[PDB]
Amino acid sequence: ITGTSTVGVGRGVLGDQKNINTTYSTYYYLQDNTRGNGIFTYDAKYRTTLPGSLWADADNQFFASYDAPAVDAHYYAGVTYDYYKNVHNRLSYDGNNAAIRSSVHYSQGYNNAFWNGSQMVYGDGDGQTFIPLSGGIDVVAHELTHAVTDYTAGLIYQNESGAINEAISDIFGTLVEFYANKNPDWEIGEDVYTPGISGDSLRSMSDPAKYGDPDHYSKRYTGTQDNGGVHINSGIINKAAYLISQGGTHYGVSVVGIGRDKLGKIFYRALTQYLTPTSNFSQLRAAAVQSATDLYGSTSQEVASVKQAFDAVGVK
Numbered sequence: 001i002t003g004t005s006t007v008g009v010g011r012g013v014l015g016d017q018k019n020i021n022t023t024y025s026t027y028y029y030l031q032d033n034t035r036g037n038g039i040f041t042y043d044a045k046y047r048t049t050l051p052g053s054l055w056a057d058a059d060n061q062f063f064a065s066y067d068a069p070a071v072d073a074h075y076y077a078g079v080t081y082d083y084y085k086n087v088h089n090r091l092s093y094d095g096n097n098a099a100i101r102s103s104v105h106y107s108q109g110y111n112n113a114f115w116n117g118s119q120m121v122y123g124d125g126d127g128q129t130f131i132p133l134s135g136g137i138d139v140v141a142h143e144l145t146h147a148v149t150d151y152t153a154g155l156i157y158q159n160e161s162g163a164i165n166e167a168i169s170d171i172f173g174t175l176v177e178f179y180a181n182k183n184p185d186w187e188i189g190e191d192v193y194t195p196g197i198s199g200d201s202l203r204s205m206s207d208p209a210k211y212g213d214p215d216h217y218s219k220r221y222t223g224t225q226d227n228g229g230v231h232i233n234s235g236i237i238n239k240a241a242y243l244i245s246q247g248g249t250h251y252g253v254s255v256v257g258i259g260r261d262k263l264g265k266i267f268y269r270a271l272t273q274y275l276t277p278t279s280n281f282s283q284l285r286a287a288a289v290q291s292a293t294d295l296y297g298s299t300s301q302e303v304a305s306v307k308q309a310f311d312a313v314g315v316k
């Protein structure tokens with residue numbers, strides 16, 4: 001909408017106070033004009049018709065329980081925008097500052113979040129399995145990264161290309177979580193998963209097997225559930241990424257870590273310059289090696305570490 005840029009204040013899903021960029025025209029809307037062509041947050045009002053209504057508030061204060069998922073969707077979309085712009089020189093998901101749209105309060109008791117081809121969508125959770133999913137910065141960044149992938153490599157959402165697609169979203173979700181530097185880790189969704197159980201998460205990049213996901217190609221799933229295991233086999237690539245960054249010895253194969261920033265550069269380059277819609281795991285290895293070669297040189301530690309990490313997870 002047309003209006004003037006304002007700064008509201010509210011509380012997120014975890015009870016933390018933050019400022020949010022809003023727009024004033026009779027109401028204060030969740031429309032941040034400070035980033036690209038805007039970040040817009042919508043109320044789906046417990047229904048499934050999208051996007052719903054652009055979020056409108058009378059007083060620019062967002063401290064109601066109902067406000068919390070909107071506050072975080074809006075704020076964490078801003079953090080994710082900042083990560084891509086500041087770290088990778090990428091302007092929004094399309095590279096041309098496309099407006100970023102999110103809807104919260106999607107459906108009832110909805111234990112998931114997604115990119116629907118045009119916007120991000122967040123359930124509130126059922127209160128036991130999840131609290132509202134926009135409370136997780138890794139979750140928000142995971143979803144926006146699906147848009148980045150769709151505009152770049154275009155990895156088809158099934159089988160190995162789909163598992164790469166998922167891993168890319170987990171990887172950048174995590175790198176954005178580290179960028180914000182509030183309780184960062186290599187787990188996915190810990191801030192919104194199971195409020196009654198401490199210490200768990202949906203997936204682990206450092207040890208995917210802790211939640212039954214494969215950490216080696218020999219353990220890959222090849223059935224038809226989950227689009228051919230896209231959220232399962234992502235563990236193999238998540239583990240490789242974790243090893244590239246942090247190092248370790250995995251099934252007897254030692255990897256020299258090179259740190260998160262270099263992991264991000266290598267995978268961002270792979271995603272945007274080398275991967276294609278049908279890339280498989282072997283092709284991802286080749287793309288990562290070439291990307292590291294471009295950035296650091298063929299004789300570099302970085303190239304050597306990429307090879308070690310893919311060796312460790314059985315991907316040649």
Ligand SMILES: CC(C)C[C@H](NP(=O)(O)CNC(=O)OCc1ccccc1)C(=O)N[C@@H](CC(C)(C)C)C(=O)O
Nearest residue numbers: 111112113114115116117133139142143146189202231
């Ligand atoms: C980071 C977590 C919190 C959320 C994450 N959502 P997503 O974006 O990967 C879901 N994709 C999805 O709907 O594709 C199908 C589609 C394709 C095209 C258009 C529209 C939809 C996830 O990991 N979801 C898991 C479920 C869970 C949460 C582990 C319980 C699962 O869906 O298996």
Ligand SMILES: [Ca+2]
Nearest residue numbers: 057059061062
């Ligand atoms: Ca208010």
Ligand SMILES: [Ca+2]
Nearest residue numbers: 183184185190
């Ligand atoms: Ca965390």
Ligand SMILES: [Ca+2]
Nearest residue numbers: 138187188189
């Ligand atoms: Ca996390």
Ligand SMILES: [Ca+2]
Nearest residue numbers: 193194195197
């Ligand atoms: Ca929990």
Ligand SMILES: [Zn+2]
Nearest residue numbers: 142146166169
């Ligand atoms: Zn996903």
